[PDB]
Structure 1
C-alpha cells in the first residue's frame, strides 16, 4: 500500500549530535535516502567547505526505504526539533513517499512518553560534487578532544593555523596581534588505554595553512568520535574525518592556503 521510509535509531543521541555538527555550517541541505542509508552531501553556506555524512542503513536497528527520497531539510529547524529529544530517547525518522513532511518520533527511555514532530520539507536543487581519489602525504589520527582544544586555543591568536607534520610529531602554529603560538604533539609509543594516542602515517612531510574559522566548525562533531583523522597533502583539500561507531562517518573538506 504506502511507500514509507522508516529509520529507527535506538542510540538517538547520534542524530542529535550529527545535527549539532552541521547546523552552524549549513542552512538547508538535501538528505539522500536510499536502501543503503542516509547520505548527506553539501557545501556550506559560504561555499568554502564541503561536508559529507554517511549513515549506513545497517546501523539502524530498523530500516525501511521503499523508494529513493531526496528530502530537502531546514537544518536549523531540524536541530531545534532534535533539541526536544532526550539523550536516551529512541528516535524514528518517518516519511511517506507522498507527503510534504518528515516525521521525527521520540520514544523516551521510560515508555509512557512519545513525542512526534512533523517538519515541512523543501525543494532544493540537488547538486553533488565528485570527490577525486587522492594519496595523502600526511595522515594524522589523534584524539578528537585534543584537536578540538588546539583549534579552540589557537583561534585566540590568529585567524589561520599552520600545520606542520613529520615522522616524530605534529606542530600547530598561529599568529596575530597578541603574538604567536606553537603547539607540538609527539607521536605516542602507544598510550595505555589507546585513544590518547597520536599516530602519523607519513610518506612526505607537509606544511599547510588552514582557516581557524572552518576548523572550529568542524570540531563540533567531536562528541561523535573519541578520535579524529586529518589527511593532508600540498595544494589539495584537507580531510577531517569522524567515525560514527560502526555506523558511518562525517567528513569535512577544506582548501589549504594557495
Structure 2
C-alpha cells in the first residue's frame, strides 16, 4: 500500500527524460526512506541507480518492489502528480485523471551500492561537461579521461584529428555554480565509450553540477545531485 505525491510534474519529468534513453526496465523499491531504483544495461556496461527522496507526501507500509517502463511514462507526461499502488502491485495507478499501468516481471538481482575509496573525486558544472562531451564526440568514438597532478584532461583521438581539453581546479565567489573541485591521490587514465557519455550528458537539466569519481580497477562513477549514479565500465586495454 504505497502512495507518493509530488507537487509539480517537472521534478519527475526531468529525471524521466534524463534516464529513459539507456535503460527501459528499471526496478524500483519503496520504503520509509525513499525510492531506490536499480537497473543494469544490456551488455553489463552501464549500471544505473536512482535515489529519490520522499521530501519531493509519502506513505509506504512495507518496503515493496515495482517495475514499470519509462516509455509510456514519457508519452503520458508530455498539476500535481500522485502515484498509488496496492498490495501485490500488479497495477500501478497515477492521478494528475487516472492512468493504470501494468507491471513486468524483471529478474534483476538487487546488488549492493558501495561507497568504496576512489583514486580521484571531482565536481564540475553540468553544462560545461555536456559541451565538452558533445565537442569531443564529433572527433572520435572513445573519450579518455586522465587525472594527473591536480589537472583533468579529456582526450579524443579521431581520424581527422585529435582534441584535448585540460582543466585546473577553480573556485568563484560571485557565482557559486561555476566552481571546479577536485581531490586526488593517484594519477589515473581510463577510456570510455562516446555513445555512453552522449546519453549520460542528457541529464544535464536535472542539476547544476556533476561529480566524477575515478578508481584504478573500479568502474567510473557519474553522480548527479534526486540522486543519480551511473557506474560505467571502461575499456580493458589497447
Residues 189 and 131 (structure 1 numbering): CA distance in 2 closer, same or farther, change over 3 Å? closer
- Map residues 81-230 of structure 1 onto 2, 5 A cutoff: 81-83=76-78, 89-98=79-88, 100-106=90-96, 115-190=97-172, 192-230=174-212
- Gap runs ≥5 in structure 1: 84-88, 107-114
More displaced stretch, 44-53 vs 234-243: 44-53
Q: Is the 8 A contact 1:167 1:200 kept in 2?
A: no
TM-score normalized with structure 2 length: 0.92
Query: 1:175-221: CA deviations, max 9, x gaps?
Result: 11221111122211435211111111111221111111111221122
Per-residue Cα deviation, 1:74-130 (whole angstroms, up to 9, x for no partner): 1222222222xxxxx322111122552112222xxxxxxxx3321112121241223
Query: 1:209-242: CA deviations, max 9, x gaps?
Result: 1111111221122111100000001221100000
- The reply to whether residue 252 of structure 1 matches residue 230 of structure 2 is yes
Q: Shift in Å at residue 56 of structure 1?
A: 2.2
- Mapped to 2, the partners of 1:76 and 1:40 lie a distance apart of 16
Question: Which residues of structure 2 form unaligned runs of 5+?
Answer: none
Note the 1:235-246 alignment, pairs <5 A: 235-244=217-226
Q: What secondary structure sits across from 2:225 in the alignment?
A: strand
Aligned partners of 1:25 and 1:45 also within 8 Å: no
Q: How many residues align?
A: 236
Cα displacement (A) at 1:8 = 0.5
Aligned alpha-carbon RMSD (Å)? 1.7
- The correspondence for 1:24, drawn from 11, 21, 25, is 21
Deviation digits for residues 18-76 of structure 1, max 9, x if unmatched? 1112211112121112222111011123321101101122x13x111123321121122
CA distance in 1 between partners of 2:171 and 2:106 (Å):
49
Residue 68 (structure 1) aligns with? 63
Write the distance in 1 (CA, Å) between the matches of 2:44 and 2:77.
26
Structure 1 segments of 4+ aligned residues over 4 angstroms from their partners:
none
Write the distance in 2 (CA, Å) between the matches of 1:203 and 1:52.
26
